[PDB]
């Protein structure tokens, strides 16, 4: 244990399934909390590590 | 019938005892209808939760509110058709096993986190003598114990 | 049975 | 360096009553020796007490029973073990109909506070129990616990003269929170009990009813399985249930005795006035003679398949689910 | 250097068996069988045996 | 006309739980095939019974 310093990088493992075709866009009538009906879920990943250690051709 | 509806609205906006010692509006919505249901079934659940019944006039659609109404028509022997057998009016009674004196009403309680909850309502004097029949129900736009 | 609105939202007394 | 040695301990007594069967029944088939908790008998085949800090009382069924002793006031209890934050109350609205006293069980996951050079310390956290009471919340109890623990610590409070019962209770935490790892004093409300403050005997049921003290025990919800023996029928006098021997000419007239004889079970189902068919038939409308013949038929000895012999038919059902009377009658009459 | 005995732990009846629900009919037992439990009154009383009463209640 | 039953009973010897005793009429089986059917012996607690 001389040096292995580094913020343990965390990653969104599980994800909500998308809403399925033919599912009716609901109506909310006064108050009430609602869950989620996800219509566009996207994971953009970046890197801020010490230089570029990923090489891609073409 | 926007006029009928306006009356109905005024009624269900009335202030009624809450049940925890406050006042409260009689009926209010707070649904989040999150499936395709048949148009008539939905319309009936609305017009059940507020006391009325939906009447397709044939021409328009109105709401006849379940109240003591004036304008009572009259029918006697001399008015309705008399069939060959001398029976102008046939009566028929609901079964005892179908008359209920306890019900579990399901509503969505915000106060314990917005999940289904059941308030049981019973008629003690009725349970006392006619046994004890329980059923279920869902009040349509209910998020208040009072309602 | 007209006197039913009374019985529900007033707790009024009607005899069977 | 390190902590205070030990300061907050506390212990749990669980008191259940298990109303099994119905009418005066024979009871446990050996005694304490057949009342397995978790899965292990209370006393082993020898009579050595295999489990400590466990009571079990037991009422048979007689109309004239005495309340089960060690239960002074029988009450329901809803376990909802859940954390409490700074700016989040809880609230439950207890809404029972009869309820006389009301018990809250609250505690902490740990109450340690650490400085430089170890020096782990007591933490002194504070909570508040409130009731709706007319307008808005008013305080009923306000508890401050001092000490350290390393795991759960539960304590109880109870109170009386609750308001009329479309009711409302609430528990909340007054100490800002645990921002840092050095001080953890997170609180939970384990469960609350509704106490009914009445000693009721259950006039014709066969309740068992056990206590455990958790310090002489291992936590696991105490899953109880009694090896019992059933109702005490009216079997015909001149019948010996021990030997399944019939004496002479029966001349009607039954006597009270516990038996497996399946024909006399069916006599019980059809004629018992309380939980049977005794309002709708009568002992008169069952041909007890044809039963008498049928029960004798049941008790004949037959090869047992392994090499022994046994009675041709015995009962041994624990009829739990309410079914149509005729369907029961006919499942008896098909056995 | 100086170990802490940390004293006794405490076990708390983690899970509790469900109560019985109205409408549910009181079974009948006929000869032998090894039954399970129909709870009709389940209650938990907590008491302390620490080193005093460092737990203060008001009202 | 089933010729081979699965009878259910409660066996106090694998701890009191459901056991199925199969019964077959081998004579009939050999020359109409094999019809197996369920059934629960009402008060039964004995494998023999």
Residue numbers in the entry:
A (entry chain h): 165 to 222
B (entry chain Z): 297 to 443
C (entry chain Z): 592 to 607
D (entry chain F): 11 to 345
E (entry chain P): 164 to 222
F (entry chain F): 395 to 443
Question: What does the original paper state about this entry?
Answer:
Bacteriophage lambda’s tip protein, gpJ, plays a crucial role when attaching to the cell surface. The gpJ protein, comprised of 1132 residues, is located at the bottom end of the lambda phage tail, serving as a key component of the lambda baseplate. The gpJ trimer not only seals the tail tip into a closed cone but also extends a central tail fiber, providing the means through which lambda phage directly interacts with its host. Genetic evidence has identified the E. coli receptor LamB (ecLamB) as the direct target interacting with gpJ during the phage’s attachment process.
When comparing the TTC structures of phage lambda in closed and open states, significant changes are observed in the structure of the HDs of gpJ. Subsequently, the FNIIIs dissociate and reposition themselves perpendicular to the HDs, inducing the transition of TTC to an open state. HDII-HDIII, the insertion domains HDII-ins1 and 4Fe-4S rotate away from the tail tip axis. Alignment of these domains with their counterparts in the closed state reveals unchanged structures, indicating a rigid rotation as a whole. The gpI segment above the gaps descends, inducing a loosening and dropping of the plugs. In conclusion, the upward movement of the FNIII, the outward displacement of the HDs, and the outward movement and loosening of the plug domains of gpI expand the diameter of the tail tube to over 3 nm, a size adequate for DNA passage.
